Amino acid sequence: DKEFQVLFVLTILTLISGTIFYSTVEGLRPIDALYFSVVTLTTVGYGDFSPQTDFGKIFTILYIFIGIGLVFGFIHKLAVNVQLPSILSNLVP
Amino acid sequence: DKEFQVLFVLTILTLISGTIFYSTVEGLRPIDALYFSVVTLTTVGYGDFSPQTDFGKIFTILYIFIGIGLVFGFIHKLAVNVQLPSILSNLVP
Amino acid sequence: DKEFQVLFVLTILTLISGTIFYSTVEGLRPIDALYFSVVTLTTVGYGDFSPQTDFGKIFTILYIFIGIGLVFGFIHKLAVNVQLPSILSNLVP
Amino acid sequence: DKEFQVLFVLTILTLISGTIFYSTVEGLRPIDALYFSVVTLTTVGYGDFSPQTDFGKIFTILYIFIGIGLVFGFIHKLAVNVQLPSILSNLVP
Ligand SMILES: [Rb+]
Ligand SMILES: [Rb+]
Ligand SMILES: [Rb+]
């Protein structure tokens, strides 16, 4: 509950940072930058977007190292502390 | 057993949702949409397919966050509660 | 030791299967098919190669679900039961 | 502390190796090679860069298997032994 709340907030802030950075330095629209930030930190990494500037590459290196742990923490607690009880609730006779 | 059964079903439903969504909104064939849904949620993310519409990008953000935990749960219990005993069975003298 | 040995063998067989499949059905050279099989099951997924046939897409769906757990098992025990002691050995005064 | 210190050093050395290898054999600039090494070992795998030579493909296979465990170890202990207390410190009334 409180754990999930913190991780949601932390995830939102990280994604806001990426949205601002990539829309500014890499010139992406502020939906494409959000989309790209999510595709990056979840490691899906389609490559339809990727940094073309050296500033962007360096930021992306740091963004990945800092952001992956947080994003996957959130995914983990979202699945465990929100999705897992909910699926069980849909089971009990 | 019962755990694996639930996770298979949950995984199938998630993949059906993606198949329907991406075939409709992104115009993919209903084998390409399934393939793309799997490549996305397993985070392989080749990028031979990716959403081109804003609707598709927004759905993909949510689809990844909701679906990755479930898909990797299934992969985990498939490997542990199905593959792991099977490999041991092929070992015992 | 015995654990790592089994996982290496299991990983090799999975990669041989992919090498054979993608060189045959997708027409890749039998170094490109191995390379592509590894890039797939480790989820790096560059997309410089990807299946173009429906046979290839369907196999890839199944290959990912079956193979990821095994490959990451091996990576995990390679890091823990081989790399982790080795790094400690290079430490003790 | 000491754990994180070792993993940072180990991660740096692995990334230096990739930077040297891909700048030499694949002809990348020594910022693009670092960027590509990071995108590879974190499994983001955009594919804006990828090995074009057989030497590069073979090295990449081995680099991924050896490097992923270490890089994700570092990410894990960076998130747990550095980020996790820091976020808690910003919480206590
Ligand atoms: Rb990935
Ligand atoms: Rb990827
Ligand atoms: Rb990719």
Inter-chain residue contact C47 with A43, CB threshold 8 Å: no
Integer angstrom CA distances of residue C23 from A51, B38, C27, C31, D55: 33, 22, 5, 9, 19
b/e for A12-26, b at 16 or more Cβ within 10 A? eebbeebbebbbeeb
Q: Does D45 touch chain B (CB under 8 A)?
A: yes
SS3 A47: coil
Which tokens sit at A55? 């500033």
Locus of tokens 């993949």: B15
| Long-range own/partner contacts, residues C4-12 (CB < 8 A, 24 or more apart) | C4/C74, C4/C77, C4/C78, C4/C81, C4/C82, C6/B87, C6/B91, C7/C70, C7/C73, C7/C74, C7/C77, C7/C78, C8/C74, C10/B87, C10/C70, C10/C74, C11/C70, C11/C71, C11/C74
Which tokens sit at C79? 């890091």
- Domains of chain D, by residue range, sit at 1-93
Distance separating alpha carbons of residues C60 and C40, to the nearest angstrom: 9
User: Is the distance from CB of A10 to CB of A70 less than 8 angstroms?
Assistant: yes
DSSP element (H, E) containing A48: none
Integer angstrom CA distances of residue C53 from A83, B78, C56: 36, 27, 5
Distance from the CA of B43 to the center of ligand 1, in angstroms?
A: 4
Vertex C12 angle, CA C6 and C14, to 5°: 105
Residue of C58, C41, C59, C37 lying closest to C49 (CA atoms) = C37
Which tokens sit at B41? 């949620």
B1-93 fold: Helix Hairpins (1.10.287)
The resolution, in angstroms to one decimal, equals 1.6
C81: buried, middle or exposed (CB in 10 Å: 19+, 13-18, 0-12)?
middle
Locus of tokens 């962007």: A56
Distance separating alpha carbons of residues C13 and B54, to the nearest angstrom: 42
Q: Does C25 touch chain B (CB under 8 A)?
A: no
